[PDB]
Each structure stands twice: as structure tokens, then as C-alpha cells.
Amino acid sequence: MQYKLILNGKTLKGETTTEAVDAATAEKVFKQYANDNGVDGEWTYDDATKTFTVTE
């Protein structure tokens, strides 16, 4: 499934996508990516457009 990520951090914003099977896998991928980008905040999920938003 095509999963989207919205980085809404005070010092890092943007949007990216990944081909992930399950929501858990998608969140794991984005979790590693975001955390490696230094963005660890609140994680919101929208099931309409398959989008995770990280609020920092």
C-alpha cells in the first residue's frame, strides 16, 4: 500500500511516501526515518489517504 508521511516539525517539514504492506510496517518505516531525521513527536494517522503526520 502507498503510505504517506507528513513531517511537521519545528525544524523539519515536508512529505514523503513508502510502499508498505501494513499500517504497522508503514509506521515502523516512518518511525525509523523520522527518528533518524531527529523528529520524534506525536504521531497522527488518517486512514482516508493513508497518511501519517508527525507533529513536533
Walkthrough of the structure:
The chain has one domain (1-56): Ubiquitin-like (UB roll), CATH 3.10.20.10. Helices cover 25% and strands 46% of the residues. The chain has one helix at 23-36, and strands at residues 2-9, 12-19, 42-46, 51-55. The longest helix has 14 residues, at 23-36. It is globular. The PDB classes it as immune system. Keywords: immunoglobulin binding domain, immune system.
What are the salient characteristics of this protein?
Ubiquitin-like (UB roll); alpha+beta; 4-stranded mixed sheet; 4 strands; monomer
CATH C-level category: Alpha Beta
CATH topology: Ubiquitin-like (UB roll)
DSSP, total strands = 4
Order of helices and strands: EEHEE
Sequence repeats: 3-56
Protein name: Immunoglobulin G-binding protein G
Organism: Streptococcus sp. group G
Subcellular location: Secreted, Cell wall
Question: Would you spell out the secondary-structure blueprint of this structure?
Answer:
Layout: E1 2-9, E2 12-19, H1 23-36, E3 42-46, E4 51-55
In short:
It is found in: Secreted, Cell wall. The chain is of the alpha+beta class. It has one helix and four strands; from the N terminus they run ββαββ.
